Design a protein around this motif. Structure first.
Motif, short mmCIF file in Angstrom:
data_model
loop_
_atom_site.label_atom_id
_atom_site.label_comp_id
_atom_site.label_asym_id
_atom_site.label_seq_id
_atom_site.Cartn_x
_atom_site.Cartn_y
_atom_site.Cartn_z
N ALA A 163 52.19 -3.00 15.47
CA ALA A 163 51.09 -3.12 16.40
C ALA A 163 51.62 -2.81 17.79
O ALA A 163 52.79 -3.04 18.09
CB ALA A 163 50.48 -4.52 16.37
N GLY A 164 50.75 -2.28 18.63
CA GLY A 164 51.20 -1.95 19.96
C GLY A 164 50.77 -0.56 20.36
O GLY A 164 49.69 -0.10 19.99
N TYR A 165 51.65 0.13 21.09
CA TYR A 165 51.30 1.39 21.75
C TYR A 165 52.46 2.35 21.60
O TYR A 165 53.58 2.06 22.05
CB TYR A 165 51.01 1.14 23.23
N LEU A 166 52.20 3.51 20.99
CA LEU A 166 53.24 4.51 20.83
C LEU A 166 53.75 5.05 22.17
O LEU A 166 54.90 5.50 22.24
CB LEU A 166 52.75 5.65 19.94
N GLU A 167 52.94 4.99 23.22
CA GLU A 167 53.38 5.44 24.54
C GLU A 167 54.39 4.50 25.18
O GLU A 167 55.03 4.89 26.16
CB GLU A 167 52.19 5.59 25.50
#
Ligand SMILES: Cc1[nH]c2ccccc2c1CCN
Ligand SMILES: [Ca+2]
Length: 223
Positions: A163-167
């Protein structure tokens, strides 16, 4: 938590701090006498701290209760972090109220794209260290299994999700270990591992709680 926001005192009433002379892990209250955390948080002599906001100041809503028993998952593997889950029984039942409350276990697994709330007292910097005294929060989506496996080739089991943000820029971090990932009012994850914090293409990895509900319920019923 890197890139999050200050939750507000007692707005995450199921969040616990595990204390062994100092805060070292988070956890989640699942009923009046049981906490779920990460197996990698195991140690002897745990005091569970409920109702906390500032972990360095007594603010008036805390309950401090010693653990009587800890149960690490029977198949926990500390090298791969597969089955990174543990149960802690409190010596006495907590007093439940609006600021200290249990979180429900899931009846189904959450799908990629679901927005979740991650919380903890962990480091707030991706490089260097700054530890907050008050609870931090982060809203983040569950990522697809394909994106998760592409970020961590050969390391993601069926008992894990990303979970989270690839950026990058927003993630859990050191000291958030064992804390809750709550989606739609149910506990879906436990802060487990990752490569650094908030790095590009390296989202956080979380224990997939929905795979453990039968073990949790059977264990609580007999202990
Ligand atoms: C749970 C945990 N504990 C750490 C300790 C050092 C670096 C990263 C982590 C992580 C992953 C954060 N997403
Ligand atoms: Ca406090």
């Amino acid at each position: 938590i890197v890139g999050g926001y200050t939750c507000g005192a007692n707005t995450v009433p199921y969040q616990v701090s595990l204390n062994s002379g100092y805060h070292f892990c988070g956890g989640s209250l699942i009923n009046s006498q049981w906490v779920v955390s990460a197996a990698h948080c195991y140690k002897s002599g745990i005091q569970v701290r409920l109702g906390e906001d500032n972990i360095n100041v007594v603010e008036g809503n805390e309950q401090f209760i010693s653990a009587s028993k800890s149960i690490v998952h029977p198949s926990y593997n500390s090298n791969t972090l597969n089955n990174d889950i543990m149960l802690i029984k409190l010596k006495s039942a907590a007093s439940l109220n609006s600021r200290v409350a249990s979180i429900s276990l899931p009846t189904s697994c959450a799908s990629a794209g679901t927005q979740c709330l991650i919380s903890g007292w962990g480091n707030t910097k991706s490089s260097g260290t700054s530890y907050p005294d008050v609870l931090k929060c982060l809203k983040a989506p569950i990522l697809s299994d394909s994106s998760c496996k592409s970020a961590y080739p050969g390391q993601i089991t069926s008992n894990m999700f990303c979970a989270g943000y690839l950026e990058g820029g927003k993630d859990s971090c050191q000291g958030d270990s064992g804390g809750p990932v709550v989606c739609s009012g149910k506990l879906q994850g436990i802060v487990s591992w990752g490569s650094g914090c908030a790095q590009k293409n390296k989202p956080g990895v979380y224990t997939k709680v929905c795979n453990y509900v039968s073990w949790i319920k059977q264990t609580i019923a007999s202990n």
